[PDB]
């Protein structure tokens, strides 16, 4: 379930190797975004060739 995903995400961060160590000047970056228009910009002609690779 989505909240459990949030938990996997947090402990996933905290389990990374030396994640919080700033000693040498390490820098962490969290980035969140959207694809903006994604559905609307899918091209049918391309989508056909892309599906031909699958099914």
């Amino acid at each position: 379930p989505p909240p459990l995903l949030v938990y996997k995400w947090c402990q996933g961060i905290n389990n990374l190797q030396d994640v919080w160590e700033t000693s040498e000047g390490e820098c962490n970056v969290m980035l969140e975004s959207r694809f903006e228009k994604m559905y609307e910009k899918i091209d049918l002609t391309l989508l056909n060739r892309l599906l031909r690779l699958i099914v």
Binding site: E40, K41, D43, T45, L46, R49, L50, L53, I54, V55
Partner: protein, 55 residues
Amino acid sequence: TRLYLKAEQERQHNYLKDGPYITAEEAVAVYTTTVHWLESRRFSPIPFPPLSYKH
């Protein structure tokens, strides 16, 4: 609703007039990349459901 469908009809008509925006070489890059991925992933294609399928 009416506005949105108007600007919609606009965008369809402009996509036909102005042609595909993905250009060409880009599209080839996409298709090729996907091909490499599915290659290294041993993905077998999904076939058509047979007449006799127990599920």
